[PDB]
Amino acid sequence: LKDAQEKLELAEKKATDAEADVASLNRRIQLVEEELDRAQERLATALQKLE
Amino acid sequence: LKDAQEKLELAEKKATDAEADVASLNRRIQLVEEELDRAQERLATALQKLE
């Protein structure tokens, strides 16, 4: 039981940290997508003014 | 020990799933980052053309 509970603890800690990493990466994805959209809009406006 | 092993299996499956999510989300992060880099390079070229 000592080994089994230690394995349980390590697996649960790893899964929780992985979930936190997933949430952080997803919010990073949405942030970078918003920045990309703003950059594309700026590019379009700049090209029109250039022409 | 039986319950501990079952929870170990569940926790390791969930952690592997979240690790795959991490891999996918980091791939998306890098790809959108590259697209944003291209967009900002285009923006810099556009400002140069404005000048």
Describe the overall structure:
The structure is cut from a larger assembly and holds two copies of chain A (51 residues). The N and C termini of chain A lie far apart (74 Å). Chain A is 96% helix and 0% strand. The first copy, chain A, has 51 residues and is mostly helical. Chain A has one helix spanning 2-50.
Choose one word for the global shape of chain A: rod-shaped
Largest interface: A-B, 29 and 29 residues
Through-space gap between termini of chain A: 74 Å
Q: Portion of residues in helices of chain A? A: over 70%
Tell me the series of helices and strands of chain A, N- to C-terminal: H
Protein name (chains A, B): Tropomyosin alpha-1 chain
Organism (chains A, B): Mus musculus
Subcellular location (chains A, B): Cytoplasm, Cytoskeleton
Family (chains A, B): Belongs to the tropomyosin family.
List keywords for this structure.
part of a larger assembly, 2 chains, about 50 residues, mainly alpha, about 95% helix
Brief account:
The structure is cut from a larger assembly and holds two copies of chain A (51 residues). With 51 residues, the first copy, chain A, is mostly helical.
Reconstruct the topology from this structure:
This is part of a larger assembly, with 2 copies of chain A (51 residues).
Chain A: H1 2-50
